[PDB]
Amino acid sequence: EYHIDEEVGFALPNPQENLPDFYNDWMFIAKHLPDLIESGQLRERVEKLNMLSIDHLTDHKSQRLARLVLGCITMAYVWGKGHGDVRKVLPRNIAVPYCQLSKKLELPPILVYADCVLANWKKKDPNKPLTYENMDVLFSFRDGDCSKGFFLVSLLVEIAAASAIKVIPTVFKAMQMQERDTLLKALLEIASCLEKALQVFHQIHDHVNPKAFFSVLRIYLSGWKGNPQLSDGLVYEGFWEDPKEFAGGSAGQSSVFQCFDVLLGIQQTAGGGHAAQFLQDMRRYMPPAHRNFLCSLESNPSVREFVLSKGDAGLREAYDACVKALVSLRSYHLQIVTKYILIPASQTGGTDLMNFLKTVRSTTEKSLLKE
Ligand code: HEM
C-alpha cells in the first residue's frame, strides 16, 4: 500500500527487464540510445513510430518499466546530442501514450527518480548480494556518462535507508504503547543505519567522474521547468492543447531524506521560500504510494514532541543521533555538489544552489536538542 520493500525500501523490489512484444518498437530505441544519439538517427526513428496503445500493459512493474523506456526516449529525443540543439515538440506518437501512462501512475510525463533509479536496475547473478559489482542499470544515455555510478550509488543509498525505514513502525507503536526502552532502541537503530548509508554514499567518488557527470548525464536529467531552453515548456502534441513545463528528475525527488525529516518532526516544508516550496513540490515527482507514506508519517504523533515531553536524556540522545546522521548525510552531499557541479561549472546560480541545500541542512541542524 505504501510500496515499501523491507530490503530496498522505496526502490522497486525486482523490476521488469522486458516489455511485452506489442511494445518492441519502444524497446529497441530505448535499448540502443548510446548509438542513435551519437549517430543521429534517434529523432527520425521516434519521428515515425506507431502510437502504440497503452491498454496492453497489465500490471505495475510493466507500467513503470514503460515510463522508464518512454521517459529515457523523451529525454534523448528532446535534448538529442545535448549540444544546445533542442526539440521543443514531442511527437503525437510517443507523447499521448506516455502522457496517459503518466496519468495512470500519477507521475509527471518526464523522467523522474522513480524511473531512472528506483525502476532502473538489475542483479547480474541473483544469488549474490545487492552490491555495486553485482548490479547494473537497464538504460543509459551515452557511454562514459557514468550513468551506472550515479543511478546505482543513488539506488544503494535508497537500500541502506530501507534498514532504517523498516524500524519506523516500531517507533510509533512504542510511543502509543508507552514502551520507552523499545523506542530508545528503535531510534538508536535508525541512527545506526543512517550512518551506514553515509559510508554507502562515499562510493559516489569511486563510480562517478565529476567532469563526465556535469557534462554528459546532467543534461539528460534536466527538465522543462524553469528552463531558458524551454521557457514556454515542452508541447505534448496530441494530449495537451498547450506545452506543459515539468522539472527534471534528480535524487531530490528521493523520499528518503524527506521521510526522516518528517519522522523526526523537522519542519522543512514550513515557512515560505524555495527551500520548503521546492521540497514540497518534489513530492509530485514521487510515486503516489510514497507520497501517501510521507503523509501518513505526518499524521502520526510527533516523535520529537514525545521525546521532549518525557525529560529523558537517553531518548534525547538517540533522537539527536538520528538528526545528526541526517545532517551528516546532507553535509557530505554538499561536498559532492561542490566536486561534481561547482568546480566543473567553472571549467550567482551556483551560490543559489548551495544556499538552498545549506538552508535545508541548517533547518535539519537546528532540530538538535543538545544544540
Ligand atoms: C554526483 C552526485 C550528486 C549530485 C551532483 C547531486 C546534486 C544535487 C543538487 C544540485 C541538488 C539540488 C536540487 C537539484 O538541483 O535537483 C540536490 C538535491 C538533493 N539531492 Fe542530490 N546530488 C547527488 C547525489 C545524491 C544522492 C546519491 C542522493 C540520495 C541518495 C541525493 C539526495 C538529494 C536530495 C534528497 C536532495 C534534495 C535536498 C535535500 O533534501 O537535502 N543526492 N542534489
Write the residue with the smallest CA distance to atom 33 of ligand 1.
252
Give me 182's grid cell: 523499545
Is the distance from CB of 184 to CB of 315 less than 8 angstroms? yes
- Domain extent, residue 120, equals 16-143+222-246
Euclidean distance between CA atoms 23 and 19, whole angstroms = 6
Residue with cell 529525443: 77
State whether the beta carbon of 252 lies less than 6 angstroms from ligand 1: yes
The distance from CA 346 to its chain's CA centroid, rounded to whole angstroms, is: 26
- Contact residues for 181 (Cβ-Cβ < 8 A; gap 6+): none
Name residue 38's amino acid.
E
Euclidean distance between CA atoms 203 and 256, whole angstroms = 18
Give me 37's grid cell: 544519439
The gap between the terminal CA atoms of the chain, to the nearest Å, is 37
The H or E element that residue 357 is part of is helix 349-365
Query: Cα dihedral sign for 34, 37, 40, 45?
Result: positive
Strand partners, 235: 89, 243
State whether the beta carbon of 257 lies less than 6 angstroms from ligand 1: yes
State whether the beta carbon of 250 lies less than 6 angstroms from ligand 1: yes
Q: What is the DSSP letter of 128?
A: S
Write the residue with the smallest CA distance to atom 27 of ligand 1.
154
Q: Is 27 exposed, middle or buried (0-12, 13-18, 19+ CB in 10 A)?
A: middle
- Rounded alpha-carbon distances, angstroms, from residue 169 to 4, 106, 186, 324: 12, 26, 9, 21
Strand partners, 9: 5
Q: List helix spans (H) across 32-167.
A: 33-39, 43-47, 60-79, 92-104, 113, 147-165
Q: Are residues 307 and 175 in the same domain?
A: yes
Q: Are residues 216 and 173 in the same domain?
A: yes
- Contact residues for 335 (Cβ-Cβ < 8 A; gap 6+): none
Q: Are residues 340 and 360 in the same domain?
A: yes
User: Does the annotation list 83 as a binding residue?
Assistant: no
Q: Are residues 52 and 193 in the same domain?
A: no
Give the relative orientation of helices 60-79 and 92-104 as an angle to the nearest 10 degrees: 140
Structure solved via: X-ray
Q: What is the DSSP letter of 301?
A: P
Euclidean distance between CA atoms 347 and 342, whole angstroms = 9
Give me 341's grid cell: 557541479
Write the residue with the smallest CA distance to atom 30 of ligand 1.
154
Give me 340's grid cell: 561534481
Q: Are residues 137 and 198 in the same domain?
A: no
State whether the beta carbon of 93 lies less than 6 angstroms from ligand 1: no
Residue with cell 514502551: 179
Q: What is the DSSP letter of 224?
A: S
Is the distance from CB of 271 to CB of 239 less than 8 angstroms? no
- In the reported structure, the alpha carbon of residue 118 is separated from the centroid of ligand 1 by a whole-number distance in angstroms of 15
How many domains does the chain fold into? Answer: 2
State whether the beta carbon of 218 lies less than 6 angstroms from ligand 1: no
Q: Which of 264, 260, 269 is nearest to 320 (CA)?
A: 264
Q: Which of 350, 336, 340 is nearest to 210 (CA)?
A: 340
- Contact residues for 324 (Cβ-Cβ < 8 A; gap 6+): 191, 368
Classified as helix, coil or strand, 244 is strand
Euclidean distance between CA atoms 156 and 201, whole angstroms = 8
Classified as helix, coil or strand, 234 is strand
Give me 276's grid cell: 520548503
Q: Are residues 213 and 289 in the same domain?
A: yes
Give me 330's grid cell: 546532507
- Contact residues for 177 (Cβ-Cβ < 8 A; gap 6+): none
Give me 218's grid cell: 546532467
Euclidean distance between CA atoms 156 and 283, whole angstroms = 21
- Please enumerate, as own/partner, the contacts of 310-318 that have beta carbons within 8 Å and a separation of 24 or more: 310/180, 312/180, 314/180, 314/184, 315/180, 315/183, 315/184, 315/187, 316/369, 316/370, 318/184, 318/187, 318/188, 318/191
Ligand 1 atom nearest to 157, measured from its CA: 30
- In the reported structure, the alpha carbon of residue 252 is separated from the centroid of ligand 1 by a whole-number distance in angstroms of 5
Q: Are residues 95 and 230 in the same domain?
A: yes
Q: Are residues 188 and 296 in the same domain?
A: yes
- Contact residues for 311 (Cβ-Cβ < 8 A; gap 6+): none
Q: List helix spans (H) across 80-143.
A: 92-104, 113
Q: Are residues 135 and 175 in the same domain?
A: no
Is the distance from CB of 325 to CB of 308 less than 8 angstroms? no
Q: Which of 314, 2, 286, 365 is nearest to 169 (CA)?
A: 2
Write the residue with the smallest CA distance to atom 32 of ligand 1.
251
Write the residue with the smallest CA distance to atom 36 of ligand 1.
252
Q: What is the DSSP letter of 5?
A: B
Q: Are residues 192 and 257 in the same domain?
A: yes
Give me 35's grid cell: 548509438
- Rounded alpha-carbon distances, angstroms, from residue 325 to 57, 73, 105, 198, 271: 41, 37, 33, 8, 24
State whether the beta carbon of 157 lies less than 6 angstroms from ligand 1: yes
Give the 3-state secondary structure percentages of the chain, helix then strand then coil, rounded to 5.
60, 5, 35
Q: Which of 369, 3, 42 is nearest to 187 (CA)?
A: 369
State whether the beta carbon of 11 lies less than 6 angstroms from ligand 1: no
Q: Are residues 226 and 212 in the same domain?
A: no
State whether the beta carbon of 336 lies less than 6 angstroms from ligand 1: yes
Mutation to probe ligand 1, out of 250, 279, 351, 364 (largest number of atoms < 8 A from CB): 250
Mutation to probe ligand 1, out of 8, 227, 294, 333 (largest number of atoms < 8 A from CB): 333
State whether the beta carbon of 308 lies less than 6 angstroms from ligand 1: no
- In the reported structure, the alpha carbon of residue 112 is separated from the centroid of ligand 1 by a whole-number distance in angstroms of 13
- In the reported structure, the alpha carbon of residue 163 is separated from the centroid of ligand 1 by a whole-number distance in angstroms of 21
Q: Are residues 149 and 95 in the same domain?
A: no
Give me 303's grid cell: 516523535
**Strand-strand pairing, 89-90 and 234-236:** parallel
Torsions phi, psi of 227, nearest 5? Answer: -115, 105
The distance from CA 208 to its chain's CA centroid, rounded to whole angstroms, is: 17
Classified as helix, coil or strand, 243 is strand
State whether the beta carbon of 198 lies less than 6 angstroms from ligand 1: no
Classified as helix, coil or strand, 253 is helix
- In the reported structure, the alpha carbon of residue 40 is separated from the centroid of ligand 1 by a whole-number distance in angstroms of 31
Euclidean distance between CA atoms 370 and 178, whole angstroms = 24
What's the alpha-carbon Rg for the chain, to the nearest Å?
Answer: 21
End of a domain among 210, 231, 246? 246
Q: Which of 1, 10, 23, 3 is nearest to 73 (CA)?
A: 23
Euclidean distance between CA atoms 322 and 196, whole angstroms = 12
Q: Which of 258, 353, 350 is nearest to 298 (CA)?
A: 258
